[PDB]
Write an enzyme that holds these catalytic residues in place. Structure first.
Site, PDB file in Angstrom:
ATOM      1  N   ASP A 265       0.799  -1.225   0.000  1.00 55.26           N
ATOM      2  CA  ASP A 265       0.000   0.000   0.000  1.00 55.26           C
ATOM      3  C   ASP A 265       0.835   1.281   0.000  1.00 55.26           C
ATOM      4  O   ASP A 265       0.496   2.255  -0.670  1.00 55.26           O
ATOM      5  CB  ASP A 265      -0.951   0.020   1.202  1.00 55.26           C
ATOM      6  CG  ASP A 265      -1.996  -1.078   1.141  1.00 55.26           C
ATOM      7  OD1 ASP A 265      -2.259  -1.603   0.036  1.00 55.26           O
ATOM      8  OD2 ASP A 265      -2.571  -1.407   2.200  1.00 55.26           O
TER       9      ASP A 265
ATOM     10  N   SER B  54     -14.324 -27.442 -28.118  1.00 54.75           N
ATOM     11  CA  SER B  54     -15.064 -27.772 -26.913  1.00 54.75           C
ATOM     12  C   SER B  54     -14.546 -29.149 -26.504  1.00 54.75           C
ATOM     13  O   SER B  54     -13.575 -29.640 -27.077  1.00 54.75           O
ATOM     14  CB  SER B  54     -16.573 -27.822 -27.189  1.00 54.75           C
ATOM     15  OG  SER B  54     -16.885 -28.795 -28.168  1.00 54.75           O
TER      16      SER B  54
ATOM     17  N   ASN C 197     -15.541 -33.341 -25.420  1.00 54.60           N
ATOM     18  CA  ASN C 197     -16.517 -34.424 -25.438  1.00 54.60           C
ATOM     19  C   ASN C 197     -16.788 -34.707 -23.961  1.00 54.60           C
ATOM     20  O   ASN C 197     -15.895 -34.549 -23.122  1.00 54.60           O
ATOM     21  CB  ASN C 197     -15.929 -35.672 -26.107  1.00 54.60           C
ATOM     22  CG  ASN C 197     -15.825 -35.543 -27.622  1.00 54.60           C
ATOM     23  OD1 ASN C 197     -14.927 -36.123 -28.248  1.00 54.60           O
ATOM     24  ND2 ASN C 197     -16.752 -34.798 -28.221  1.00 54.60           N
ATOM     25  N   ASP C 198     -18.004 -35.136 -23.643  1.00 56.30           N
ATOM     26  CA  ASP C 198     -18.377 -35.402 -22.259  1.00 56.30           C
ATOM     27  C   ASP C 198     -18.544 -36.868 -21.877  1.00 56.30           C
ATOM     28  O   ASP C 198     -18.914 -37.707 -22.698  1.00 56.30           O
ATOM     29  CB  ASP C 198     -19.673 -34.660 -21.925  1.00 56.30           C
ATOM     30  CG  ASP C 198     -19.476 -33.164 -21.814  1.00 56.30           C
ATOM     31  OD1 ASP C 198     -20.483 -32.430 -21.855  1.00 56.30           O
ATOM     32  OD2 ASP C 198     -18.314 -32.722 -21.675  1.00 56.30           O
TER      33      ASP C 198
ATOM     34  N   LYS D 120     -12.248 -29.376 -13.850  1.00 53.79           N
ATOM     35  CA  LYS D 120     -12.958 -28.595 -14.855  1.00 53.79           C
ATOM     36  C   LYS D 120     -13.561 -27.376 -14.156  1.00 53.79           C
ATOM     37  O   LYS D 120     -14.447 -27.506 -13.313  1.00 53.79           O
ATOM     38  CB  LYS D 120     -14.059 -29.432 -15.514  1.00 53.79           C
ATOM     39  CG  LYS D 120     -14.654 -28.802 -16.771  1.00 53.79           C
ATOM     40  CD  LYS D 120     -15.683 -29.722 -17.416  1.00 53.79           C
ATOM     41  CE  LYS D 120     -16.193 -29.152 -18.733  1.00 53.79           C
ATOM     42  NZ  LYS D 120     -16.933 -27.868 -18.547  1.00 53.79           N
TER      43      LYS D 120
ATOM     44  N   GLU E  52      -9.625 -20.354 -18.142  1.00 50.78           N
ATOM     45  CA  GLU E  52     -10.933 -19.999 -17.625  1.00 50.78           C
ATOM     46  C   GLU E  52     -10.867 -18.788 -16.703  1.00 50.78           C
ATOM     47  O   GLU E  52      -9.941 -18.666 -15.900  1.00 50.78           O
ATOM     48  CB  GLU E  52     -11.479 -21.186 -16.827  1.00 50.78           C
ATOM     49  CG  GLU E  52     -12.979 -21.240 -16.713  1.00 50.78           C
ATOM     50  CD  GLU E  52     -13.627 -21.788 -17.968  1.00 50.78           C
ATOM     51  OE1 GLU E  52     -14.852 -21.637 -18.102  1.00 50.78           O
ATOM     52  OE2 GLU E  52     -12.920 -22.380 -18.813  1.00 50.78           O
TER      53      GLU E  52
ATOM     54  N   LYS F 256     -18.243 -35.149 -16.421  1.00 53.19           N
ATOM     55  CA  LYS F 256     -19.182 -34.210 -15.821  1.00 53.19           C
ATOM     56  C   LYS F 256     -19.856 -34.766 -14.573  1.00 53.19           C
ATOM     57  O   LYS F 256     -20.383 -35.879 -14.583  1.00 53.19           O
ATOM     58  CB  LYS F 256     -20.262 -33.845 -16.843  1.00 53.19           C
ATOM     59  CG  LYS F 256     -19.733 -33.293 -18.157  1.00 53.19           C
ATOM     60  CD  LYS F 256     -19.335 -31.835 -18.029  1.00 53.19           C
ATOM     61  CE  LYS F 256     -20.560 -30.963 -17.800  1.00 53.19           C
ATOM     62  NZ  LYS F 256     -20.212 -29.522 -17.692  1.00 53.19           N
TER      63      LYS F 256
HETATM   64  N1  LIG Z   1       0.794  -8.073   0.221  1.00 46.83           N
HETATM   65  C1  LIG Z   1       0.822  -7.991  -1.088  1.00 46.83           C
HETATM   66  O1  LIG Z   1       1.770  -8.337  -1.740  1.00 46.83           O
HETATM   67  C2  LIG Z   1      -0.364  -7.429  -1.871  1.00 46.83           C
HETATM   68  C3  LIG Z   1      -0.307  -7.349  -3.334  1.00 46.83           C
HETATM   69  C4  LIG Z   1      -1.435  -6.812  -4.020  1.00 46.83           C
HETATM   70  C5  LIG Z   1      -2.582  -6.363  -3.315  1.00 46.83           C
HETATM   71  N2  LIG Z   1      -2.569  -6.472  -1.884  1.00 46.83           N
HETATM   72  C6  LIG Z   1      -3.772  -5.970  -1.179  1.00 46.83           C
HETATM   73  O2  LIG Z   1      -4.926  -6.231  -2.042  1.00 46.83           O
HETATM   74  C7  LIG Z   1      -5.886  -5.155  -1.876  1.00 46.83           C
HETATM   75  C8  LIG Z   1      -6.264  -4.564  -3.230  1.00 46.83           C
HETATM   76  O3  LIG Z   1      -5.080  -3.921  -3.839  1.00 46.83           O
HETATM   77  P1  LIG Z   1      -4.915  -3.865  -5.423  1.00 46.83           P
HETATM   78  O4  LIG Z   1      -6.355  -3.485  -5.930  1.00 46.83           O
HETATM   79  O5  LIG Z   1      -3.969  -2.788  -5.743  1.00 46.83           O
HETATM   80  O6  LIG Z   1      -4.614  -5.193  -6.008  1.00 46.83           O
HETATM   81  C9  LIG Z   1      -5.220  -4.170  -0.846  1.00 46.83           C
HETATM   82  O7  LIG Z   1      -5.750  -4.380   0.475  1.00 46.83           O
HETATM   83  C10 LIG Z   1      -3.756  -4.515  -0.941  1.00 46.83           C
HETATM   84  O8  LIG Z   1      -3.009  -4.187   0.223  1.00 46.83           O
HETATM   85  C11 LIG Z   1      -1.473  -6.998  -1.164  1.00 46.83           C
END
Ligand SMILES: NC(=O)c1ccc[n+]([C@@H]2O[C@H](COP(=O)(O)O)[C@@H](O)[C@H]2O)c1
EC number: 6.5.1.2
Length: 313
Positions: free
Chosen positions: A39, A84, A86-87, A116, A171, A311
């Site tokens: 942060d 896609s 096959n199932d 999956k 995904e 599935k």
């Molecule tokens: N400790 C870490 O490496 C790390 C990395 C990315 C986001 N976070 C946390 O995720 C939350 C969202 O941040 P971002 O939207 O910038 O990804 C915040 O609370 C942030 O501190 C922590």
């Protein structure tokens, strides 16, 4: 005061450090530093970008919040089709699949087994390591260009450590808790809830306002590439390891089975563990491991002959 010259250099340092922490947090699901560390550095970067908006780059972590609003999605062709599967629904279908594989190959075969994931199929194109296109599977040969929305999906790398040109497929889904949280928010706002995480992910990726998508907390699991030319992998299990090595999030529950019996055991093991996972799964995908053998088996019109999706009921 901090000059543009000094900021230009500092901005890159921050992007690299912050992107590594994000890789650990979102891709490896294992942060190394406390959130406050991230942060603090994030805020420093925001201050620099605010003072010098020209230093904002597509791989800056500050761009994850989105901002672009589209009028609609452009068509996204898949020159290399997205088939896609096959199932299969019974132990019988699975052993029958193995019988057909052995009949065609002429010897016992190893199978790469994976869960999956019930989400939206996606294809991510990188050029020189840079994310350039995000697309839905659509009808297999033409999907929707949802590049801007995918830029907000935290586990999708904007720049790979190595400047490789490849197109990875997998995904994009919504974790159970995120799905729960989203429906509560919809109930609070008097909106119709989503019937299941699959519909929630699809609906989220169809949003034209990227700022909304950024708040939907979608995640990803990549399992293959359109063209293995730039890859060194010779087997599916190797491909999963390589996808992880280059920076993508892969599912850790995969297993390489040397016999069909081991495959059935896998299906049983994860069937009983089905609700213990943070995401929903609608089954198990069984793939002939060796690429040389997949090639020999080929594809039908709808799917490969070297794979089958068991599935769940
Ligand atoms: N400790 C870490 O490496 C790390 C990395 C990315 C986001 N976070 C946390 O995720 C939350 C969202 O941040 P971002 O939207 O910038 O990804 C915040 O609370 C942030 O501190 C922590």
């Amino acid at each position: 005061p901090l000059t543009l010259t000094a900021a230009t250099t500092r901005a890159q340092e921050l992007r690299k450090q912050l992107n590594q922490y994000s890789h650990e947090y979102y891709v490896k699901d294992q942060p190394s530093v406390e959130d406050y560390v991230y942060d603090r550095l994030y805020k420093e970067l925001v201050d620099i970008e605010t003072e010098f908006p020209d230093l904002i780059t597509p791989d800056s972590p500050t761009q994850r919040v989105g901002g672009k609003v589209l009028s609609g999605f452009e068509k996204a062709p898949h020159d290399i089709p997205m088939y896609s599967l096959n199932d299969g629904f019974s132990k019988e279908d699975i052993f029958a699949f193995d019988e057909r594989v052995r009949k065609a190959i002429g010897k016992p075969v190893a199978y790469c087994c994976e869960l999956k994931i019930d989400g939206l199929a996606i294809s991510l194109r990188y050029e020189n390591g840079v994310f350039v296109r995000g697309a839905t599977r659509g009808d297999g040969t033409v999907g929707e260009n949802i590049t801007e929305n995918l830029r907000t999906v935290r586990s999708v790398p904007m720049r790979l450590t190595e400047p490789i040109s490849v197109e990875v497929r997998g995904e994009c889904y919504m974790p159970k808790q995120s799905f729960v949280a989203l429906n509560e928010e919809r109930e609070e706002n008097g909106q119709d809830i989503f019937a299941n995480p699959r519909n929630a992910a699809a609906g989220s990726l169809r949003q034209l306002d990227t700022k909304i998508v950024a708040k939907r907390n979608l995640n990803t699991f990549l399992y293959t590439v359109a063209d293995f030319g730039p890859m060194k992998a010779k087997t599916q299990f190797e491909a999963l390891e390589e996808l992880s090595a280059i920076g993508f999030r892969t599912n850790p529950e995969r297993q390489l089975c040397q016999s069909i019996d081991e495959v059935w055991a896998y299906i049983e093991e994860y069937h009983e563990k089905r609700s213990t996972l943070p995401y929903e799964i609608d089954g198990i995908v069984i793939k002939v491991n060796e690429f040389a053998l997949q090639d020999e088996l080929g594809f039908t019109v709808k799917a490969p002959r070297w794979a089958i999706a068991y599935k769940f009921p």
